Amino acid sequence: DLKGTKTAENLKQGFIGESMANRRYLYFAKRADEEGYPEIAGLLRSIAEGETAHAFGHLDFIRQGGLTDPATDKPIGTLEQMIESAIAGETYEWTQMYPGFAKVAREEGFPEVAEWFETLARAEKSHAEKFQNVLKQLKGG
Amino acid sequence: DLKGTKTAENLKQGFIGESMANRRYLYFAKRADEEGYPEIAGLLRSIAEGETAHAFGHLDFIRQGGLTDPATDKPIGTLEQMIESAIAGETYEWTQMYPGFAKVAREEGFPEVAEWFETLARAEKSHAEKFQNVLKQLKGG
Numbered sequence: 001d002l003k004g005t006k007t008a009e010n011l012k013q014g015f016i017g018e019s020m021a022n023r024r025y026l027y028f029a030k031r032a033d034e035e036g037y038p039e040i041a042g043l044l045r046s047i048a049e050g051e052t053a054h055a056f057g058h059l060d061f062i063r064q065g066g067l068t069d070p071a072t073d074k075p076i077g078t079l080e081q082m083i084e085s086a087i088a089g090e091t092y093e094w095t096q097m098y099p100g101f102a103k104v105a106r107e108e109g110f111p112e113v114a115e116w117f118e119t120l121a122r123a124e125k126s127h128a129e130k131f132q133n134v135l136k137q138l139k140g141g
Numbered sequence: 142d143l144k145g146t147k148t149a150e151n152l153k154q155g156f157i158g159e160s161m162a163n164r165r166y167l168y169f170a171k172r173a174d175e176e177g178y179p180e181i182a183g184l185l186r187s188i189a190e191g192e193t194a195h196a197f198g199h200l201d202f203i204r205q206g207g208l209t210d211p212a213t214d215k216p217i218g219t220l221e222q223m224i225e226s227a228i229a230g231e232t233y234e235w236t237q238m239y240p241g242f243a244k245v246a247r248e249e250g251f252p253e254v255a256e257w258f259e260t261l262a263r264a265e266k267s268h269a270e271k272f273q274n275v276l277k278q279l280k281g282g
């Protein structure tokens with residue numbers, strides 16, 4: 001009964017925010033590492049494990065409710081569906097999103113940012129190919 | 142020169158998507174684990190390390206450009222700023238976001254989802270307190 005509800009939206013938003021929180025806190029922990037704050041770094045890493053649990057619990061409800069992947073709007077019920085979601089998102093990123101970001105970065109006078117986005121387009125293409133090979137393995141039984 | 146540009150927006154969007162990709166792929170790897178696909182699971186985990194590198198590189202450009210944290214719109218130049226960003230986001234989540242999500246979940250007839258959001262409000266309150274104690278440690282020199 002979750003499809004089309006505000007609660008469906010809120011689970012998706014929760015997933016986005018918890019995902020960012022884990023990345024942010026681990027990035028902050030690396031700064032603590034460099035500067036010599038190991039107890040702060042360790043606390044950041046442990047809090048980040050909390051954010052993993054929160055993100056994964058949001059995804060559990062999203063699937064239990066027949067809602068789609070926050071990133072791709074594809075189903076993620078089965079493992080094969082999960083890999084198809086990965087392929088769809090990767091294809092978008094390597095063919096469309098990162099090339100477009102690189103072009104705009106060049107247009108706006110940020111060539112180093114553009115080369116980073118071009119690196120990421122190539123990297124996401126490789127990810128897409130790896131996930132396509134996974135799907136072939138799963139569909140072959 | 143990045144402030145107010147499309148490239149600033151694109152770095153922020155890139156960070157969001159890479160953050161979700163790492164969480165998604167690790168969630169998918171746990172399903173592969175359970176079902177008995179260890180080579181798929183290991184590949185998912187390795188691809189997820191790629192997404193960490195991509196997310197962190199987006200954050201590097203965001204900081205090098207004097208842009209704010211995608212999650213909180215607070216600066217993240219210094220370690221103290223990073224902890225202040227964590228406190229701001231956590232305060233929002235525990236006081237405002239998760240309580241509101243829980244109330245809406247109850248209004249819409251999803252009591253189990255509501256109890257999950259109430260658990261997360263309490264958890265984020267604890268995170269906020271831990272980060273406040275970190276900031277006190279840093280400001281005390």
Ligand SMILES: [Cl-]
Binds near residue numbers: 036
């Ligand atoms: Cl420390």
Ligand SMILES: [Cl-]
Binds near residue numbers: 179
């Ligand atoms: Cl396998």
